[PDB]
Amino acid sequence: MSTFIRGPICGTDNCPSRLWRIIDGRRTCQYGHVMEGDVEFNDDEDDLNGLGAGVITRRLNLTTNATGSFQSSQLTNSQLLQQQQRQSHKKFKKLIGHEAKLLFLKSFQFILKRQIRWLITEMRFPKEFEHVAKIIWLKILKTINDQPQEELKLQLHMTSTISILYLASTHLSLPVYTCDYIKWICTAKMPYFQASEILPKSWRIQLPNYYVSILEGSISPFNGQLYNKIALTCGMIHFKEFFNSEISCQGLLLKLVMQCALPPEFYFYTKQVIEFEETDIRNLTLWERTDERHTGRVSNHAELRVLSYFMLTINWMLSFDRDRQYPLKWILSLTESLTQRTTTSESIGRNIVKVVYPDKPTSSDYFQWSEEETLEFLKWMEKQFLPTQTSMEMTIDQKIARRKLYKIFPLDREDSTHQLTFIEDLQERYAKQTPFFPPARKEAIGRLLTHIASQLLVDFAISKEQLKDCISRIKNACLHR
Amino acid sequence: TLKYICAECSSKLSLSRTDAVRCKDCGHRILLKARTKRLVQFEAR
Amino acid sequence: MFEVPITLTNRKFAQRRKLKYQYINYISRRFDRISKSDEERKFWKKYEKPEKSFEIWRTVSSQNKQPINKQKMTYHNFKKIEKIPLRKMEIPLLHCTKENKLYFQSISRGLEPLKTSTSEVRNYRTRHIVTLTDLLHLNVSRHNWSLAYKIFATLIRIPGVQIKSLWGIGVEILDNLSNSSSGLDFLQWMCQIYSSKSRFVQNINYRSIVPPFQTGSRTHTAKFAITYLWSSLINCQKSMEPTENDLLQELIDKISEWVLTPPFMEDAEVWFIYASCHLLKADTLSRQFVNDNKNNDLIGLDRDIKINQVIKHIHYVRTFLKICLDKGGFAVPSRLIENQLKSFESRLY
Amino acid sequence: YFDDTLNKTKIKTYHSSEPAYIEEVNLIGDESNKFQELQTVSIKYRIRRTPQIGDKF
Amino acid sequence: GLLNLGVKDIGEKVIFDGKPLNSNSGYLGNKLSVSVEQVSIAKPMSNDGVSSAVERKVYPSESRQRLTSYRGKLLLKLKWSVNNGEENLFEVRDCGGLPVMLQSNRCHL
Ligand SMILES: [Zn+2]
CA distance E20 to C156: 59
Contact between E8 and E57 under an 8 Å Cβ cutoff? The reply is no
Residue B12 is inside which H or E element, if any? strand B12-13
CA distance B21 to D36: 6
- From ligand 1's centre to the CA of C245, what distance in Å? 27
Q: Helix, strand, coil % (nearest 5) of chain A?
A: 50, 0, 45
The sign of the torsion formed by the CA atoms of A307, A309, A310, A311 equals positive
Pick from C101, C174, C139: nearest CA to C2: C139
- From ligand 1's centre to the CA of B5, what distance in Å? 8
Taking CA B5 as the corner, what is the angle to CA B1 and CA B10, rounded to the nearest 5 degrees? 130
CA distance E9 to E5: 6
Q: In chain E, count of helices (H) and strands (E)? A: 2, 5
Residues of B in contact with E66 (CB under 8 A): 29-30
State in Å, rounded, how far the first CA of chain D is from the last one: 43
Q: Pick left, alpha or beta for residue A65 (phi over 0 → left; psi -120 to 50 → alpha; otherwise beta).
A: alpha
CA distance E32 to A181: 74
CA distance B39 to C29: 84
Distances (CA, A) of A297 to A209, A274, A366, A464, A473: 35, 20, 31, 14, 10
Q: Which candidate from E43, E51, E57 shows the least CB-CB separation from C196? A: E51
Contact C261 E75 (CB under 8 A): yes
Pick from A278, A283, A287, A249: nearest CA to A163: A287
Q: Within chain B, what is the greatest distance between any pair of CA atoms?
A: 43
CA distance C280 to C274: 10
In a 3-state reduction of DSSP, which class is residue A28?
Answer: strand
Contact E65 D33 (CB under 8 A): no
CA distance D29 to C162: 30
CA distance C38 to C17: 11
Q: Helix, strand, coil % (nearest 5) of chain E?
A: 15, 35, 45
Give the distance from CA B3 to its chain's centroid.
4
Instruction: Name chain D's partners: 3 or more CB pairs within 8 A.
Output: A, B, E
Residue C137 is inside which H or E element, if any? helix C124-140
Give the distance from CA E87 to its chain's centroid.
20
Residue C168 is inside which H or E element, if any? helix C164-168
Chain D: give the shortest CA distance to residue A84, in Å. Answer: 8
Pick from A255, A117, A266: nearest CA to A178: A255
Q: Pick left, alpha or beta for residue A432 (phi over 0 → left; psi -120 to 50 → alpha; otherwise beta).
A: alpha
Contact between C294 and C306 under an 8 Å Cβ cutoff? The reply is yes
CA distance C30 to C24: 10
C98 C-beta neighbours (distance < 10 Å), count: 7
Q: Within chain C, what is the greatest distance between any pair of CA atoms?
A: 93
Pairs of residues, one from chain A and one from chain C, whose beta carbons lie less than 8 Å apart? 85
Residue of D nearest to B21 (CA): D29
Contact D4 A73 (CB under 8 A): no
Residue of A20, A80, A396 to mutate when probing chain D, most D C-beta within 10 A: A80
Q: Where are the alpha helices (DSSP H) in C53-97?
A: 76-82, 85-94
> How does DSSP assign D2-52, residue by residue?
EETTTTEE-------SS--EEEEEEEE-TT-SS-TT--EEEEEEE------
CA distance E85 to E82: 6
Q: In what order do the strands lie in the sheet with B30-33?
A: B12-13, B4-6, B30-33, D21-28, D40-46
> How does DSSP assign A434-461, residue by residue?
-TT--HHHHHHHHHHHHHHHHHHHHHTT
Torsion of CA E49, E52, E56, E58, to 10 degrees: 40
Pairs of residues, one from chain A and one from chain B, whose beta carbons lie less than 8 Å apart? 10
Contact between E14 and E82 under an 8 Å Cβ cutoff? The reply is no
- From ligand 1's centre to the CA of E57, what distance in Å? 14
CA distance A74 to C345: 87
Distances (CA, A) of E63 to C303, D30, E45, E58, E59: 46, 10, 11, 8, 7
Pick from A295, A294, A311: nearest CA to A303: A311
CA distance C249 to C247: 5
Distances (CA, A) of C263 to C191, C255, C274: 12, 9, 11
Taking CA E37 as the corner, what is the angle to CA E35 and CA E39, rounded to the nearest 5 degrees? 115
The sign of the torsion formed by the CA atoms of A303, A309, A314, A315 equals positive
- From ligand 1's centre to the CA of D36, what distance in Å? 18
Total residues found in chain A within this entry: 481
Question: Identity (one letter) of the amino acid at A244?
Answer: N
CA distance C179 to C158: 24
Q: Say whether residue B15 is in contact with chain D using an 8 A CB cutoff.
A: yes
Give the distance from CA C206 to its chain's centroid.
15
Distances (CA, A) of A224 to A293, A296, A299, A312, A464: 14, 10, 10, 22, 12
Domain extent, residue B37, equals 3-45
Give the distance from CA A16 to its chain's centroid.
67
Residue of E nearest to D30 (CA): E66
CA distance D30 to A290: 65
CA distance E35 to A381: 59
Residue of B nearest to E65 (CA): B30
D touches B, CB cut-off 8 Å, minimum 3 pairs: yes
Pick from E71, E78, E36, E93: nearest CA to C199: E93
Half-sphere exposure of residue D16, counting CA atoms within 13 Å on the CB side? 8
Residues of A in contact with E53 (CB under 8 A): 395, 397-398
Q: Helix, strand, coil % (nearest 5) of chain B?
A: 0, 20, 80
Residue of B nearest to D27 (CA): B31
Contact C259 E77 (CB under 8 A): no
Report phi then psi at C213, rounded to 5. Answer: -120, -5
Pairs of residues, one from chain B and one from chain E, whose beta carbons lie less than 8 Å apart? 10
Pick from A463, A208, A446: nearest CA to A314: A446
Question: Identity (one letter) of the amino acid at E70?
Answer: Y
Contact B30 D28 (CB under 8 A): yes
The sign of the torsion formed by the CA atoms of C201, C206, C210, C214 equals negative
Contact between A161 and A192 under an 8 Å Cβ cutoff? The reply is yes
What's the Rg (C-alpha) of chain A? 37
Residues 6+ apart with CB under 8 A from A326: A318
The binding site of A comprises 10, 15, 29, 33
Residue C280 is inside which H or E element, if any? helix C269-287
Helix axes C85-94, C13-33, angle to 10 degrees: 160
State how beta strands D40-46 and D21-28 pair.
antiparallel
Total residues found in chain D within this entry: 57
Residues facing B13 on adjacent strands:
B4
Residues facing E77 on adjacent strands:
E92
CA distance A225 to A240: 21
Resolution of this model in Å is 4.3
Q: Where are the alpha helices (DSSP H) in B1-45?
A: none
> How does DSSP assign E29-79, residue by residue?
S-B--EEEEEEEE---EE-SSSSSS--EE--HHHHHHHT---EEEEEEEEE
Residue of D26, D27, D30, D34 to mutate when probing chain E, most E C-beta within 10 A: D30
- From ligand 1's centre to the CA of B11, what distance in Å? 6
Distances (CA, A) of C148 to A386, C140, C162, C182: 18, 6, 18, 16
CATH number at residue B22: 2.20.28.30
Half-sphere exposure of residue C44, counting CA atoms within 13 Å on the CB side? 15
In a 3-state reduction of DSSP, which class is residue E95?
Answer: strand
Contact between C219 and C262 under an 8 Å Cβ cutoff? The reply is yes
CA distance A460 to A467: 9
Q: How is residue A214 annotated by DSSP?
A: G
Residues 6+ apart with CB under 8 A from E8: none
Chain A: give the shortest CA distance to residue D51, in Å. Answer: 27
Q: Which candidate from C122, C128, C134 shows the least CB-CB separation from A358? A: C122
Contact A219 C123 (CB under 8 A): yes
Give the distance from CA B10 to its chain's centroid.
10
Pick from C176, C138, C169, C144: nearest CA to C155: C169
The sign of the torsion formed by the CA atoms of C133, C138, C143, C148 equals negative
CA distance C130 to C121: 10
Residues of D in contact with B29 (CB under 8 A): 28-32
> How does DSSP assign A39-65, residue by residue?
-------S-------------SSS---
Residues of A in contact with C135 (CB under 8 A): 369, 374, 377-378
A197 C-beta neighbours (distance < 10 Å), count: 18
Residues of E in contact with B30 (CB under 8 A): 62, 65-66
- Residues A35-50 as b or e (16 or more Cβ within 10 Å = b): ebeeeeeeeeeeeeee
CA distance A344 to A350: 11
Q: Where are the alpha helices (DSSP H) in A148-248?
A: 157-172, 178-187, 202-205, 226-237, 239-242
Q: In chain B, count of helices (H) and strands (E)? A: 0, 3
A471 C-beta neighbours (distance < 10 Å), count: 19
The sign of the torsion formed by the CA atoms of C17, C23, C27, C33 equals positive
Residues facing D25 on adjacent strands:
D43
Q: How was this structure obtained?
A: cryo-EM
CA distance A207 to A213: 8
- From ligand 1's centre to the CA of A27, what distance in Å? 49
Q: Say whether residue D4 is in contact with chain A using an 8 A CB cutoff.
A: yes
The sign of the torsion formed by the CA atoms of C316, C319, C325, C327 equals negative
Residue A428 is inside which H or E element, if any? helix A422-432
- Count how many domains chain B has: 1
C310 C-beta neighbours (distance < 10 Å), count: 22
Q: Say whether residue E7 is in contact with chain C using an 8 A CB cutoff.
A: no
Residues of D in contact with E62 (CB under 8 A): 30
Q: How is residue A151 annotated by DSSP?
A: -
Half-sphere exposure of residue A21, counting CA atoms within 13 Å on the CB side? 14
Residues of D in contact with E65 (CB under 8 A): 26, 28, 42
Contact between C132 and C155 under an 8 Å Cβ cutoff? The reply is yes
Residues of B in contact with A400 (CB under 8 A): 24-25, 27
